[PDB]
Short mmCIF file of C-alpha atoms and ligand atoms in Angstrom, two decimals:
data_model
loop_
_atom_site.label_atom_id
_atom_site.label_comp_id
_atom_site.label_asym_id
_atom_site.label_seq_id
_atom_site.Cartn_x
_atom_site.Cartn_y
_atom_site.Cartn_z
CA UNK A 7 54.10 85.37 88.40
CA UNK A 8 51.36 83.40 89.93
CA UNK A 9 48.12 84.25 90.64
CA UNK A 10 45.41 81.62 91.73
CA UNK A 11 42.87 84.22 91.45
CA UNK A 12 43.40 84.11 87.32
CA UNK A 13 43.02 79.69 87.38
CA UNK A 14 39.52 78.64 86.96
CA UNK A 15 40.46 75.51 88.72
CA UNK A 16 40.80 77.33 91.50
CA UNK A 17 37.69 78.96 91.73
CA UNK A 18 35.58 75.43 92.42
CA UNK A 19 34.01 75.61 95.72
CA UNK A 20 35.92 72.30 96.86
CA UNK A 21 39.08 74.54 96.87
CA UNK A 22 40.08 75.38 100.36
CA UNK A 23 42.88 77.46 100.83
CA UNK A 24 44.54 78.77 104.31
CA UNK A 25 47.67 80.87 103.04
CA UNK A 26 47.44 81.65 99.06
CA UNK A 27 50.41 84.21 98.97
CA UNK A 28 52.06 81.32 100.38
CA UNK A 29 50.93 78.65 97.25
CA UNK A 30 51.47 81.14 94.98
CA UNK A 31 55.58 81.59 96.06
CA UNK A 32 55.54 77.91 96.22
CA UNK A 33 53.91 77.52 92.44
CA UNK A 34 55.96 80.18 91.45
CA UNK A 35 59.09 78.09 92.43
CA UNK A 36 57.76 74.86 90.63
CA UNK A 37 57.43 76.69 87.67
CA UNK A 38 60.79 78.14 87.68
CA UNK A 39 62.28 74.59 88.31
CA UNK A 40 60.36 73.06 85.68
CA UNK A 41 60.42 69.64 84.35
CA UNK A 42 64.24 69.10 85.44
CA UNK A 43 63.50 69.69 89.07
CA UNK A 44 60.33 68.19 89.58
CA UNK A 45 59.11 64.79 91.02
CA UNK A 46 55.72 63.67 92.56
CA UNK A 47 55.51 61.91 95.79
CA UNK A 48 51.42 60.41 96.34
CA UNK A 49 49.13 57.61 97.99
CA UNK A 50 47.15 55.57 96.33
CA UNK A 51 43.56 54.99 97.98
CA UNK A 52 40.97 57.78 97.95
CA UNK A 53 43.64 60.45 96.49
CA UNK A 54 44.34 58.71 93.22
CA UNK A 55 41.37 56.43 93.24
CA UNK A 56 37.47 58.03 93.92
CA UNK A 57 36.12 57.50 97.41
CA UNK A 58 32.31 57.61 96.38
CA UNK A 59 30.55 57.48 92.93
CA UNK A 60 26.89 57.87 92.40
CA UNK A 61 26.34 58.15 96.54
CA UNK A 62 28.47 54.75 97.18
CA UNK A 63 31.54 54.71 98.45
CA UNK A 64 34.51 53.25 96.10
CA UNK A 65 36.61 50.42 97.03
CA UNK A 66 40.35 50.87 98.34
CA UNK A 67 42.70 48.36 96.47
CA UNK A 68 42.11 46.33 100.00
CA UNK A 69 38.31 46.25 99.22
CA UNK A 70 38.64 45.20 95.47
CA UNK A 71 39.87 41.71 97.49
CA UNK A 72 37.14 41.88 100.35
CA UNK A 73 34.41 42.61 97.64
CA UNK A 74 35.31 39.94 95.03
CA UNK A 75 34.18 36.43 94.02
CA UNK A 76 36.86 34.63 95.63
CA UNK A 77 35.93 35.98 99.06
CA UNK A 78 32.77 34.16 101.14
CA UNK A 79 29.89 36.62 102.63
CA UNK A 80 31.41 35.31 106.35
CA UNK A 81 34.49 36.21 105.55
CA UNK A 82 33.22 39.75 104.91
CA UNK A 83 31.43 39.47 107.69
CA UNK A 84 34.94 39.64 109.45
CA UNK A 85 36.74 41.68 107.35
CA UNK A 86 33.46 44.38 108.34
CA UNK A 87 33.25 44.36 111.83
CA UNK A 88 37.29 44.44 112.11
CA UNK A 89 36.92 47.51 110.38
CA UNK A 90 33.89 48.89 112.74
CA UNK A 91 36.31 48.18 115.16
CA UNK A 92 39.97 49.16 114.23
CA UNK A 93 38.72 52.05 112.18
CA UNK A 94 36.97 53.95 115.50
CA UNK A 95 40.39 53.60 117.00
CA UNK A 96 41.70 55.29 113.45
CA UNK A 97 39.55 58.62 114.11
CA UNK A 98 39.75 58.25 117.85
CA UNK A 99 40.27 62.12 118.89
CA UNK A 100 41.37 61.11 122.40
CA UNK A 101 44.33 58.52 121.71
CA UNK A 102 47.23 60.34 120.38
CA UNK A 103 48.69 59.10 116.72
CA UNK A 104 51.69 56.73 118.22
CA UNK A 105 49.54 55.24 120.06
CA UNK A 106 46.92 54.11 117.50
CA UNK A 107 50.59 52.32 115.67
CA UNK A 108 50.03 48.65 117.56
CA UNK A 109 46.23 48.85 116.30
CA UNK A 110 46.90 49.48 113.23
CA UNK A 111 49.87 46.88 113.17
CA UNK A 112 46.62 44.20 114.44
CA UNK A 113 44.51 45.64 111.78
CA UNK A 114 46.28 45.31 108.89
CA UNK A 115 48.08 41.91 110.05
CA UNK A 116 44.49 40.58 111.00
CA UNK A 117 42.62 42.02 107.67
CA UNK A 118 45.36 40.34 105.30
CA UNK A 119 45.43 37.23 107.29
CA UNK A 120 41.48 36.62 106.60
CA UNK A 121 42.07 37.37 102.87
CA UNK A 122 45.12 34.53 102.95
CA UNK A 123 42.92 32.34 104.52
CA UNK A 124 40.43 32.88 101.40
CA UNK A 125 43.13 31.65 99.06
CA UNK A 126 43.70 34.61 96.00
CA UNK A 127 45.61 33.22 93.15
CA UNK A 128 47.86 35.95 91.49
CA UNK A 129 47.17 34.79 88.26
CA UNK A 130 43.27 35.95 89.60
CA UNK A 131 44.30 39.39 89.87
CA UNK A 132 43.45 40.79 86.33
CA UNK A 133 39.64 39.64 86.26
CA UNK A 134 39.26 40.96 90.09
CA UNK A 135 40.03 44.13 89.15
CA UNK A 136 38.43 44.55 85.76
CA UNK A 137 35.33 43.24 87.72
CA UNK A 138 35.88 45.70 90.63
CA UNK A 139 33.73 48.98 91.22
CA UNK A 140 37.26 50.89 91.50
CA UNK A 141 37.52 54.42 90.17
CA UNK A 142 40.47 56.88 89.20
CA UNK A 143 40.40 60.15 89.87
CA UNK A 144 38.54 62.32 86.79
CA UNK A 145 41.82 63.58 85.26
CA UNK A 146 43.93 60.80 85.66
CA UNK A 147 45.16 60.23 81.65
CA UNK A 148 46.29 63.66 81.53
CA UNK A 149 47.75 63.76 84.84
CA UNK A 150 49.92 60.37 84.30
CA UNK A 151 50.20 61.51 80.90
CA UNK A 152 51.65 65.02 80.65
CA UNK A 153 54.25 63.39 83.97
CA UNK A 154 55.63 60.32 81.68
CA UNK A 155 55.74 62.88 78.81
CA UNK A 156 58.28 64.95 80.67
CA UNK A 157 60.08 61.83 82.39
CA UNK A 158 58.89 63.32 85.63
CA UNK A 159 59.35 60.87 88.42
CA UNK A 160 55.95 59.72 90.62
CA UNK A 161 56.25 58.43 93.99
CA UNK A 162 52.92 56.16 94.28
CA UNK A 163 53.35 55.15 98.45
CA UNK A 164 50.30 53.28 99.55
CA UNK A 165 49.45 51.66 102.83
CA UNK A 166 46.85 49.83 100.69
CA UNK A 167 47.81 46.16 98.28
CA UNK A 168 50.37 46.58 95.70
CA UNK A 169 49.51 43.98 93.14
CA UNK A 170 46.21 45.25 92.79
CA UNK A 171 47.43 49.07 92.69
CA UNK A 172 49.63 47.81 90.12
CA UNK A 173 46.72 46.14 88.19
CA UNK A 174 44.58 48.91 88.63
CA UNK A 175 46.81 51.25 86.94
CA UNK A 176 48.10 48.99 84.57
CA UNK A 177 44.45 48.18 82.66
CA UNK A 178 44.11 51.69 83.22
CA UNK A 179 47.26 52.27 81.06
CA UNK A 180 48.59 54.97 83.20
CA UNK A 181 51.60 52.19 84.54
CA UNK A 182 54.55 53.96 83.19
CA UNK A 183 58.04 53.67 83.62
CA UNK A 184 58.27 57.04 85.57
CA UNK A 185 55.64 55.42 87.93
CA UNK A 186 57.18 53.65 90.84
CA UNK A 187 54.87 51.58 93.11
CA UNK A 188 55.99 51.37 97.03
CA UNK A 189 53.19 49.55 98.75
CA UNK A 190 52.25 46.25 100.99
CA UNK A 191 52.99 43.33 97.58
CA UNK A 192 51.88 39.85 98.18
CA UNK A 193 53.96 37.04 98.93
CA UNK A 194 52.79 33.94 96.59
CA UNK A 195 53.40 29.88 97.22
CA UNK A 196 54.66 27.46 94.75
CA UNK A 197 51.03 27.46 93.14
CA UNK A 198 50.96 31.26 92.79
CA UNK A 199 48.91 31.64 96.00
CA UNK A 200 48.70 34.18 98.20
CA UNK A 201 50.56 32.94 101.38
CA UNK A 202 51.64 36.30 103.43
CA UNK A 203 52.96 39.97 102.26
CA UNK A 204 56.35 41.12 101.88
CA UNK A 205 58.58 43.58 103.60
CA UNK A 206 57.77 45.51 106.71
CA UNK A 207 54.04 46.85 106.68
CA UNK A 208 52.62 49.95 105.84
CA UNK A 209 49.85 51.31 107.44
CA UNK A 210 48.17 54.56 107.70
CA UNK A 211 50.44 56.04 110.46
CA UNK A 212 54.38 55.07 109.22
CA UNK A 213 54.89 55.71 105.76
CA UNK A 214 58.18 57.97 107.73
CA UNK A 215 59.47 54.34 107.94
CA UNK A 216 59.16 53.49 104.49
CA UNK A 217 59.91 57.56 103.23
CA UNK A 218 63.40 57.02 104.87
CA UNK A 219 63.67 52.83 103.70
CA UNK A 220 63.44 54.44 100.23
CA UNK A 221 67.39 56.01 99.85
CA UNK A 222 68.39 54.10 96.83
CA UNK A 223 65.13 55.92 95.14
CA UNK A 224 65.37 59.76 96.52
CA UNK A 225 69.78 59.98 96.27
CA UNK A 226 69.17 59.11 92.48
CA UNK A 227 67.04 62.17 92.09
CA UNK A 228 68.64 64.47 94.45
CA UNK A 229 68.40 67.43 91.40
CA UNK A 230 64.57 67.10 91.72
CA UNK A 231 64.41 69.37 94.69
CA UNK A 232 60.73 70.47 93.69
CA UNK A 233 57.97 68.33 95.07
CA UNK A 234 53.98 67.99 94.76
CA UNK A 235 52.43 65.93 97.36
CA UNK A 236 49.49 64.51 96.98
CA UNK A 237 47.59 62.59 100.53
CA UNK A 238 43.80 62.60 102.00
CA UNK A 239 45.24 61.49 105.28
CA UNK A 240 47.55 63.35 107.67
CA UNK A 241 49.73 60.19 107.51
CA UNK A 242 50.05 61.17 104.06
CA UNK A 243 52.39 64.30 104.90
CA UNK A 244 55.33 61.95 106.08
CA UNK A 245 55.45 60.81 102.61
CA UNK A 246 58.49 63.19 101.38
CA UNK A 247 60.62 62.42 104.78
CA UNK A 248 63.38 60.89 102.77
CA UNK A 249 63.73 63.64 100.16
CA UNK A 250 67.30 64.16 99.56
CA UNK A 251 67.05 68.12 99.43
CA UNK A 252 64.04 70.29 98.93
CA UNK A 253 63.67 73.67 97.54
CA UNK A 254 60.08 74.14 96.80
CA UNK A 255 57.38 71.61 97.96
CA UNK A 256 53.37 72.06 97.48
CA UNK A 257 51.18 69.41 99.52
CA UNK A 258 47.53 68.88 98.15
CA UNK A 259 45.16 66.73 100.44
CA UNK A 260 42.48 65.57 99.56
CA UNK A 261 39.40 65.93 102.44
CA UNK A 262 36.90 63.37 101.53
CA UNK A 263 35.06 63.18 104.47
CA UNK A 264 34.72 63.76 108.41
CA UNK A 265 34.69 67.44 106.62
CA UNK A 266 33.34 69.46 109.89
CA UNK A 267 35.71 67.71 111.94
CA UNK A 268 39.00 67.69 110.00
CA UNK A 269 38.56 70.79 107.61
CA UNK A 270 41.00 73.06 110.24
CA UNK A 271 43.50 70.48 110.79
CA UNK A 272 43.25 69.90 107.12
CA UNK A 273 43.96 73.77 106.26
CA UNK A 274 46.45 74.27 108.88
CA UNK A 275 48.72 71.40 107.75
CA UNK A 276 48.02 70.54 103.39
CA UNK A 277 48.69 74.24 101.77
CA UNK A 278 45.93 73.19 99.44
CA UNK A 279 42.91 71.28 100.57
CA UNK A 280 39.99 69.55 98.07
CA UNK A 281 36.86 69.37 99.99
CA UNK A 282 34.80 65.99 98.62
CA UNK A 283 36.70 66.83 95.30
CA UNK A 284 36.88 63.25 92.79
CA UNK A 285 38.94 65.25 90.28
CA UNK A 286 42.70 65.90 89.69
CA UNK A 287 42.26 69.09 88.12
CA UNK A 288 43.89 71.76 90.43
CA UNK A 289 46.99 69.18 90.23
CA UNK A 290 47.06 69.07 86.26
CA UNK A 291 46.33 73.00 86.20
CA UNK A 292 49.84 73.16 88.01
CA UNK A 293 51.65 70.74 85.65
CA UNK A 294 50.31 72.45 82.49
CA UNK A 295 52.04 75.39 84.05
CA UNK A 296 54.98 73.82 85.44
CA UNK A 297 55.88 71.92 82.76
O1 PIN B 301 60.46 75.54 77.94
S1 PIN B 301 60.46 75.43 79.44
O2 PIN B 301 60.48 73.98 79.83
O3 PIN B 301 61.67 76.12 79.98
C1 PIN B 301 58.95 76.18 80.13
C2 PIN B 301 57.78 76.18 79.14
N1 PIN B 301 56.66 75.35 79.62
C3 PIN B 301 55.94 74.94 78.38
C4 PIN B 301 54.45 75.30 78.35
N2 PIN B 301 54.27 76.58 79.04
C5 PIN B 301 52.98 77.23 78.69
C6 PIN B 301 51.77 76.60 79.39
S2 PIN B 301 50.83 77.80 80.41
O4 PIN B 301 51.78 78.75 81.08
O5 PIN B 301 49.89 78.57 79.54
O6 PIN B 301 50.04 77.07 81.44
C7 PIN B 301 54.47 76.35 80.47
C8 PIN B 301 55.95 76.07 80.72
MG1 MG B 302 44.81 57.29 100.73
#
């Protein structure tokens, strides 16, 4: 049996919870699935990754770009006041989520197109992100760790820059095989330049496009009918759309900020939320029991 009340990780004040009878039949299930039924499905940016250390905020994998050598203070200049305004129309309570779609189509398109225009080589990549002020989660070996120890598949879906995700991780040396990376990946010219980005985008709003694009991934593990998701955005929750079949799934979201504002929504719609939380230990206090 499960009871949250007995989990010290559970009892940190950035542990929001709407429904616990409800977690606890859903943990319950994990654990009765174990290893053999499990997979994780997650984002990247601000759920994996920190979004503030020491009273400044982290950088998304797009911001390790924007922030680096190889980028010009005008072209941050751009990059900035895009965001001032594309990111208003992000938290805009008025417009409804479809359609904020085509401005986050412009975003995106217009935010990548400045950083092509800045020329990053992909043989670059490495230093960039070893010089970056990018964070994982406090947790993270033992949360990749204890999953590629039990050959449990993760799900890493990010609306943010694969390559640098990748090299993120990979330095980290949390890049297993069990790890598979679904994200917006550069397209390089003959020179190893970065000239465009592959495959259809992902933004914030329609990872349901890439959840159901993703068939050849979820039919192989159709046994692995129990899922934790992990998201800080409500996007995030569309995440485990193409699941094959699904018996027992938990969804964690992270709440890093707009607290007052979202903390309702947040309750109502993640069965766990972690208010301003940079840790991954109500996760990997599930896995030690589910696994
Ligand atoms: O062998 S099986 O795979 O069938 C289930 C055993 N598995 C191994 C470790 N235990 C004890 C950790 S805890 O319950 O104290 O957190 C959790 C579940
Ligand atoms: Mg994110």
């Amino acid at each position: 049996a499960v009871h949250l009340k007995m989990m010290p990780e559970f009892q940190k004040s950035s542990v929001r919870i709407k429904n616990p009878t409800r977690v606890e039949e859903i943990i319950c299930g994990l654990i009765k699935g174990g290893a053999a039924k499990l997979q994780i499905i997650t984002d990247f940016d601000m759920t994996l990754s920190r979004f503030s250390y020491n009273g400044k905020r982290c950088p998304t994998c797009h911001n390790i770009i924007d922030n680096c050598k190889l980028v010009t203070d005008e072209c941050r200049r751009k990059l900035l006041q895009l965001k001032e305004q594309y990111y208003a129309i992000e938290v805009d309570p008025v417009l409804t989520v479809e359609e904020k779609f085509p401005y986050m189509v412009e975003w995106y398109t217009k935010s990548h197109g400045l950083l092509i225009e800045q020329g990053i080589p992909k043989a670059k990549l490495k230093e960039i992100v070893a010089d970056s002020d990018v964070m994982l989660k406090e947790g993270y070996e033992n949360f990749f760790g204890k999953l590629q120890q039990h050959g449990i598949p993760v799900f890493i879906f990010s609306a943010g820059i694969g390559d640098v995700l990748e090299e993120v991780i990979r330095q980290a040396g949390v890049y297993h095989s069990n790890v598979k990376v679904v994200s917006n990946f550069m397209d390089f010219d003959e020179n190893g330049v970065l000239k465009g980005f592959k495959g259809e985008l992902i933004h914030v709003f329609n990872k349901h496009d890439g959840a159901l694009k993703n068939t050849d991934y979820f039919s192989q593990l159709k046994d692995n009918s129990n899922i934790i998701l992990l998201g800080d955005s409500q996007g995030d929750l569309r995440m485990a759309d193409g699941v094959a079949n699904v018996e027992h799934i938990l969804k964690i979201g992270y709440l890093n900020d707009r607290v007052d504002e979202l903390l309702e929504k947040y309750m109502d719609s993640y069965d766990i939320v972690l208010v301003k939380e940079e840790s991954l230990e109500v996760v990997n206090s599930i896995l030690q029991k589910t696994l």
